[PDB]
Enzyme design. Structure first.
Site, PDB file in Angstrom:
ATOM      1  N   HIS A 108      -7.821  -5.822   0.528  1.00  0.00           N
ATOM      2  CA  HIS A 108      -6.541  -5.243   0.622  1.00  0.00           C
ATOM      3  C   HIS A 108      -5.757  -5.362   1.706  1.00  0.00           C
ATOM      4  O   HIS A 108      -6.101  -5.333   2.978  1.00  0.00           O
ATOM      5  CB  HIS A 108      -6.738  -3.648   0.340  1.00  0.00           C
ATOM      6  CG  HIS A 108      -5.317  -2.833   0.611  1.00  0.00           C
ATOM      7  ND1 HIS A 108      -4.683  -2.679  -0.457  1.00  0.00           N
ATOM      8  CD2 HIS A 108      -4.872  -2.220   1.640  1.00  0.00           C
ATOM      9  CE1 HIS A 108      -3.715  -1.884   0.198  1.00  0.00           C
ATOM     10  NE2 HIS A 108      -4.055  -1.514   1.225  1.00  0.00           N
ATOM     11  N   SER A 161       0.888  -1.311  -0.075  1.00  0.00           N
ATOM     12  CA  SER A 161       0.105   0.091   0.149  1.00  0.00           C
ATOM     13  C   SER A 161       0.975   1.194  -0.117  1.00  0.00           C
ATOM     14  O   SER A 161       1.624   1.556  -1.104  1.00  0.00           O
ATOM     15  CB  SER A 161      -1.013   0.144   1.462  1.00  0.00           C
ATOM     16  OG  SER A 161      -2.012   0.852   0.919  1.00  0.00           O
ATOM     17  N   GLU A 165      -9.354  -5.246  -4.248  1.00  0.00           N
ATOM     18  CA  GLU A 165      -8.661  -4.229  -3.621  1.00  0.00           C
ATOM     19  C   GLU A 165      -9.511  -3.312  -2.708  1.00  0.00           C
ATOM     20  O   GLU A 165      -8.953  -2.792  -1.453  1.00  0.00           O
ATOM     21  CB  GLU A 165      -7.756  -3.402  -4.446  1.00  0.00           C
ATOM     22  CG  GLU A 165      -6.723  -4.084  -5.081  1.00  0.00           C
ATOM     23  CD  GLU A 165      -5.368  -4.134  -3.921  1.00  0.00           C
ATOM     24  OE1 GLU A 165      -5.408  -3.237  -3.188  1.00  0.00           O
ATOM     25  OE2 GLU A 165      -4.325  -4.761  -4.430  1.00  0.00           O
TER      26      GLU A 165
END
Ligand SMILES: O=C(/C=N/O)NCCCN1CCC[C@H](CCNC(=O)/C=N/O)C1
Ligand SMILES: O=C(/C=N/O)NCCCN1CCC[C@H](CCNC(=O)/C=N/O)C1
Lengths: 540, 540
Positions: free
Chosen positions: A444, A200, A331
């Site tokens: 995610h 991320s 995601e």
């Protein structure tokens, strides 16, 4: 006393700890100081190197977590609290950790450097899912992970001024990379085979180090998991960073009305406020009405980034660089419970169409109403325009494509077509121990536990298939760390992972089944975000 | 003597001819005058009813074709010349034709009324593919087809004026419908069960009669094949029709160099010009280069259509109406050889991406640069953005969806959701004797020969399965003529044809295989044209 738990670095001597693994012990050096504590007048300033110390610094435990917001949306819930600080908070947090196998490697060994994510407002190297004892034992590599300043303490920016230049949280990571260059050899690690990998905001950080010349000399390969520097959430303009910084000062009483005014009296006033007071007003300066927007992120000042990440990616020579890049299957699903109407992890989130059209404005903020209509057109199944289950997954894709997948595919294609050997993946296995609801699929962040071999921990209730699956992924990442090619240099029996090219756009699916090659990182949807959407917003 | 070929109508007596089919004879009355020849001072004027005549008007051959442009793109080519005039051109062309079974029906019989297509600039009821000899024999129905004025003679309009009011070609069709109300009983046909069916511009004509109150009272059911009144080519604005008429006058020398150019002297100058002179300058009235844009079409004046076709369809009640609409599999492929770069019926038309980009402007004219890029976005496979075969079919879909399929699906949705029972189809059989190249698939207009049973003509080399297939189609069309429902009332054994609703959007594929139900008249692509593109063009 073990002679291997004792190491001397340029700053002094350290005592490590011996960690156990179902396949052998590992030497861990947790809590090594790499910078002077950025406290007092050093708040908001670039890091200074840790001055050498007498005696033996204890390196048997994780040090403190940098001051950061604590997620309280679901108290007690494992799925959110696994990302919360597990050590106490402090501004004295610039410490790194080094894992190394037992016995210590005699020849120089490749090094993996982890950079945690968390939207540049949270995260810590001490999280249980970043435990490198399993990756170091099974692949005999050296893993390093640092702490960098998040939030205002790392990214508050009054651009141009020297009291708050911004991007100091990125310089913290750089200093840890400079530290690895000078001291990883003492642990058996090869400073000429350094592979950065983050997730991320960590992946966005890795990309910002590819585009910053002073950082390029400190590593040789890159792995960007579910993030990229060119994302709409990872950078901010100078004027906007100034507006957010001045807002934070006002919310905590700076300047004391009425005194002003210039940047030097604002930062001086900010330096007198307790750290928790600054954190208590962090989500209080930005538009206030959107998931996926973070207040204090890297600014494009002209310093650390000579221009925007999008420009540097386009006008950049990437020959001799190998990059592994990828995303997860869903995601955006975990972000929808943070503001999107109708969503709740404890029901099925079967949203109505009114909530879908409202959720698009929250998932894609700061866009014209005409631009919102184009998103609705592209993401609606017009044979079932009111099916709640399909609308839920469409908004999950709207947010996933706009924030992660399409900024990543844009970068990956631009890298491969300009000299970089690129490999691509999509993580498509949902952990059998996952606490998030079934409809979120593979959210995610939940590939990290498999990259770090967490299923090998005997106290966790993972399956035998997931244990073998985690060992496969660890070999992929380590092989890429060693050779730059996730395929084993000899094994022809295992399926082949072809490089990612700007034309073929090949990637593999990572799950319990063997590798399967596919084409297109959501090629159709990402053509809307990367190609068409800019052309509209130019004609407002 | 065969007293069957002798029929009296309200205007006089007629003598017909006996036509042979492999399954029995048919009585045909070809060439019945239904209006005074619109010549001399009657050019551009609405039609006057044919005054009664003394004697026996001969009705054994088709009368003259209305003055119209003759396609000369591929001389000698069956695919183009099958639509060209096959009788001598004349302004004396307002004649209709009536087929009826032998023996003549004793009880009233439902009647089909055909309205030919040809972009309102061409076409004739005398074309071999409109031969009603087989549809009447196999299904025992009455078929009627008329001629109407096309081009400037039918649709030149100086709006508001008395000399050239416009839409007189549509009034020609209405007049033939009033004639059907007053004289179809003499042939054994039921005036209380007449179903209009047309193709292309004829299908758009059928729809304009649904939306005109005086025409609505003359028929009960409607069939629209590959065309609708709301298409971007079927109508034109008031001020643009004036601009086109004045331009045509200038090209033929009207007004003379020195005299005023008010409306009454312009038409007086146009009426003195030979008909072929007006036809020779019909296409220079559009200086724009664009496939699918026709010079003289019905004008939105407030008379024949009180508002635009799109407005009337939205605000209309259609209870007690049965509609049958449909399209072919590849509507736009026939028209790409008419100006789209790189296209040729004699090679494979493997166009480059540059040619695809240029072709979009020609297929979708009068749209902004921002609007064309949206079309390129929607119609490009971004995994194969340069594959010539995919770009060819993309442009074929761009043109087919913009001009035919989506204006029809729009109409079919609004009809069913406002009272009308609607049935939908997609013609997917390519004729074994088709002369167009294989890459055009099932081009526009090549379902007509199967609706009219032409494969049963022994002089043609059709397959045995196409004979049975054509008989099945004629049964669908006649059933909808009698029942209002294409399904056989005495048979639940055959596969069923479900109605078309605005939500389920069901249609069937008409081909050699049995019926198959599907959902969506290209719903994804048509959402771009019907929903998003107006929002894009409204913000300019
Ligand atoms: O993952 C993500 C974001 N993705 O966008 N986490 C964001 C965490 C939530 N954050 C932003 C929303 C507001 C909230 C503060 C509310 N707290 C109170 O106590 C209010 N009382 O009224 C902090
Ligand atoms: O089906 C369709 C419509 N598709 O949009 N047919 C269009 C009719 C053909 N037309 C095109 C434009 C005008 C041109 C006349 C030029 N003729 C010459 O001889 C010129 N010499 O310079 C023929």
């Amino acid at each position: 006393e073990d002679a291997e738990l004792l190491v001397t670095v340029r700053g002094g001597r350290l005592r490590g700890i011996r960690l156990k693994t179902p396949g052998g012990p590992v030497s861990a050096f947790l809590g090594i100081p790499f910078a002077e504590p950025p406290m007092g007048p050093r708040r908001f300033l670039p890091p200074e190197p840790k001055q050498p110390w007498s005696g033996v610094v204890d390196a048997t435990t994780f040090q403190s977590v940098c001051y950061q917001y604590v997620d309280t949306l679901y108290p007690g819930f494992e799925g959110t609290e696994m990302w919360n600080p597990n050590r106490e908070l402090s501004e004295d947090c610039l410490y790194l950790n080094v894992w190394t196998p037992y016995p210590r490697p005699t020849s120089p060994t490749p090094v993996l450097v982890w950079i945690y994510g968390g939207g540049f407002y949270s995260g810590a190297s001490s999280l249980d899912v970043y435990d490198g004892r399993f990756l170091v034992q099974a692949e005999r590599t050296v893993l390093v992970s640092m702490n960098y300043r998040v939030g205002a303490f790392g990214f508050l920016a009054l651009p141009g001024s020297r009291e708050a230049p911004g991007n100091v949280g990125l310089l913290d990571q750089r200093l840890a990379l400079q530290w690895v260059q000078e001291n990883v050899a003492a642990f058996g690690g090869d400073p000429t085979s350094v592979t950065l990998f983050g997730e991320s905001a960590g992946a966005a950080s890795v990309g910002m180090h590819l585009l910053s010349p002073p950082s390029r000399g400190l590593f040789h390969r890159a792995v960007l998991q579910s993030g990229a520097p060119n994302g709409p959430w990872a950078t901010v303009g100078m004027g906007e960073a100034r507006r957010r910084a001045t807002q934070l000062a006002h919310l905590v009483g700076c300047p004391p009305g009425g005194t002003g005014g210039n940047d030097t009296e604002l930062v001086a006033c900010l330096r007198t406020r307790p750290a928790q007071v600054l954190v208590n007003h962090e989500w209080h300066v930005l538009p206030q009405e959107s998931v996926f927007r973070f207040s204090f992120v890297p600014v494009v000042d002209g310093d650390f980034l000579s221009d925007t990440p999008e420009a540097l990616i386009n006008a950049g020579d990437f020959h001799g660089l190998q990059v592994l890049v990828g995303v997860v299957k869903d995601e955006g699903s975990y972000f929808l419970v943070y503001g999107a109407p109708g969503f709740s992890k404890d029901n099925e989130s079967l949203i109505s169409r009114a909530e879908f059209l409202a959720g698009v404005r929250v998932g894609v903020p700061q866009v014209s109403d005409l631009a919102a209509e184009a998103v609705v057109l592209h993401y609606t199944d017009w044979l079932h325009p009111e099916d709640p289950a399909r609308l839920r997954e469409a908004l999950s894709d709207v947010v996933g494509d706009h924030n992660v997948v399409c900024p990543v595919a844009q970068l990956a294609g631009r890298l491969a077509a300009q000299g970089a050997r690129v490999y691509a993946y999509v993580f498509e296995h949902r952990a059998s121990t996952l606490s998030w609801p079934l409809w979120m699929g593979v959210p995610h962040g939940y590939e990290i536990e498999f990259i770090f071999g967490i299923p090998l921990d005997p106290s966790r209730n993972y399956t035998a298939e997931e244990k073998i699956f985690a060992q496969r992924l660890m070999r992929y990442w380590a092989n890429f760390a060693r050779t730059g090619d996730p395929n084993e240099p000899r094994d022809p029996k295992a399926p082949q992972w072809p490089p990612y090219t700007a034309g073929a756009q090949q990637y593999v699916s990572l799950d319990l089944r063997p590798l399967e090659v596919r084409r297109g990182l959501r090629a159709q949807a990402c053509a809307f975000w990367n190609r068409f959407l800019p052309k509209l917003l130019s004609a407002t």
